[PDB]
Design a protein around this ligand. Structure first.
Ligand code: MG
Ligand code: MG
Ligand code: MG
Ligand code: ZN
Lengths: 69, 100, 124, 55, 49, 122
RNA sequence: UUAAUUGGAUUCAACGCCGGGAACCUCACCGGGGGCGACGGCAGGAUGAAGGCCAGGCUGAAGGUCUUGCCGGACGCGCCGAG
């Protein structure tokens, strides 16, 4: 069925496609790059390495080392 | 050819008084009257925080309002219906009469 | 190396009814278009069509951050409010289907300074 | 018309569509069984309405 | 100031240059756009000659 | 209208019936001042007593009522002074035409003077 | 850190607490735009005060202001008290 594939309604051709391995990776990279080229909010979040789906960032999502006073 | 009488009140004594008066009226005449059936009491519980601010340990009030009910069946006979229709219940009692 | 959105060129998208275009946009945009444009969005669209027809050669500014980008807006420049100033956004074909507000950030990027007094248990 | 710019919009949902009938506060409104009273105001008038603290 | 003129009046004859809005009666006077009868209170798109 | 317009003399009876017949009719009637307001009153016939005073210069907004006199019945009279015209009916200003429509108990002298003015000059 | 990231509470007895799960409202913060002075009296005002508009500019949008010219008849923030 058309609702079981991992790329329904492809952005270029408009067909319902399923991809594996290198093609899948390159399609994902192309999607992110397209977001970045138009300077959309999501693309900027991708560039800075910050959460993209609306999460709070004050408490969790900490990856680093403690700063001293 | 039977009438259904519904009663409700926040006070048990008044409710009992009205039911007993209707029972006396039904006794004073040749007529069968199914005894006053007690329906389950309606309870309204509201729980609230006590403090106006938000400092200190949280403590709560549990306020309650209780509404009692009764059901009475009688056969619609005009000699008996006039006596019951002219009774006045206290202001804190709701009375509803219907014919089935 | 041309542009295609669901197998259709930009010119073919230009001569498409609104209802027909809704079937190619994603679910959120299809629902928003099916429910109709808001009156402020109507005024903005009137100004956009006027500017396209060759009239109104003055900058177009708007408070409408929830407006969806449509194929007829490509090629223009629109100034979208971000809270305090109108920022310029140039509509490219790959912007079709996105809200305007997505291109006008409302917050400034954070560059942290030194933690102050009280920032750690031993600094209080 | 200038008085148009003093007038409020008549909302039907949200915190702005409900005010306490005793003091006018927005916010913590008790909507149970058609009451429209703030938590503050309900505490001090509950005995007058017939409520009791049995437990 | 004063605004009552441009009505053609002679020594004993009176006739108005600006007609009245047909929804109401005479006496009320329109504008002088030339393009259309503004009418002040209701509005019309008729392209007065 | 204006003193600079010889229509006729200043008959004492005319001022007598145009001035001293409105104070007793002010408390039982309606008053509509203003020549812009009255121009409509006179054209449409709303007014019942047109009392036109000789104080308006030039003959610009006054040159409407005398030409329109012969189109309707317009029982009309003139007022010598303007300072007390509002005092007789209205407010403490100078009035130009105080139109009263259907006044209570103000009929006999008004009819007599209106007939005299009709038989005087129209 | 920021244009603003509104404010209260800091041991037990502050920190899923202020019934505080804020898209608008809530809202107190920030950028921008409009409106409001019962009552006493001053300039004023029917030779019409204050107030209200079809159309098109300015504008995020607006008879808010403006342009074009229509409206209505009695109070009067251009001023001092006062609320
Ligand atoms: Mg805080
Ligand atoms: Mg929420
Ligand atoms: Mg808010
Ligand atoms: Zn309250």
């Amino acid at each position: 069925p058309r609702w079981a594939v991992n790329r329904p309604k492809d952005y270029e051709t408009g067909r319902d496609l399923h991809l594996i391995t290198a093609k899948l990776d390159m399609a994902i990279r192309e999607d992110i790059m397209r977001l970045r080229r138009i300077r959309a909010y999501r693309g900027i979040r991708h560039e800075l390495g910050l959460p993209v789906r609306g999460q709070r960032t004050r408490s969790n999502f900490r990856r680093g080392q403690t700063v001293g006073v | 050819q039977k009438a259904r009488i519904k009663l409700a009140s926040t006070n048990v004594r008044s409710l009992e008084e009205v039911a007993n008066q209707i029972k006396q009226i039904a006794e004073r005449t040749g007529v069968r009257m199914s005894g006053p059936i007690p329906l389950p009491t309606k309870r309204i519980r509201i729980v609230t925080r006590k403090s106006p601010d938000g400092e200190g340990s949280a403590t709560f009030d549990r306020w309650e309002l209780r509404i009692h009910k009764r059901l009475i069946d009688i056969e619609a006979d005009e000699r008996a219906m006039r006596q019951i229709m002219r009774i006045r219940v206290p202001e804190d009692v709701t009375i509803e009469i219907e014919l089935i | 190396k041309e542009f295609r959105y669901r197998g259709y060129t930009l010119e073919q998208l230009m001569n498409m009814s609104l209802e027909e275009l809704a079937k190619l946009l994603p679910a959120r945009q299809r629902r928003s278009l099916k429910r109709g444009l808001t009156p402020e969005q109507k005024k903005l669209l009137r100004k956009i069509r006027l500017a396209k027809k060759g009239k109104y050669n003055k900058p177009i500014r708007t408070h409408c951050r929830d407006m969806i980008v449509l194929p007829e807006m490509v090629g223009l420049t629109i100034y979208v409010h971000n809270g305090k100033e109108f920022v310029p956004v140039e509509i490219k074909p790959e912007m079709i289907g996105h809200y305007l507000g997505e291109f006008a950030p409302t917050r400034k990027r954070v560059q942290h300074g030194a933690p102050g007094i009280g920032a750690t248990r031993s600094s209080m | 018309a200038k008085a148009d710019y003093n007038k409020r919009k008549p909302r039907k949902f949200g915190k702005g569509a409900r005010r306490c009938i005793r003091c006018g506060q927005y916010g913590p409104i008790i909507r149970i069984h058609g009451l429209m009273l703030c938590r503050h105001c309900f505490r001090e008038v509950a005995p007058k309405l017939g409520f009791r603290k049995y437990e | 100031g004063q605004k009552w003129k441009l009505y053609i009046v002679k020594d004993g004859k009176v006739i108005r240059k600006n007609k009245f809005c047909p929804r109401c009666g005479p006496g009320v006077f329109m504008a002088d756009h030339g393009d259309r009868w503004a009418c002040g209170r209701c509005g019309y798109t008729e392209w007065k000659k | 209208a204006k003193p600079s317009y010889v229509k006729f003399e200043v008959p004492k009876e005319l001022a007598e019936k145009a001035l001293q017949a409105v104070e007793i009719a002010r408390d039982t009637g309606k008053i509509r001042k203003g020549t812009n307001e009255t121009t409509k009153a006179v054209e449409r016939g709303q007014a019942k007593l047109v009392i036109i005073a000789e104080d308006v210069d030039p003959e610009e907004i006054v040159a409407h009522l005398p030409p329109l006199c012969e189109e309707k019945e317009i029982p009309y009279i003139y007022v010598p002074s303007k300072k007390e015209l509002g005092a007789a009916a209205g407010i403490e200003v100078a009035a130009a035409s105080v139109a009263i429509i259907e006044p209570g108990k103000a009929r006999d002298l008004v009819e007599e003077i209106a007939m005299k003015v009709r038989e005087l000059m129209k």
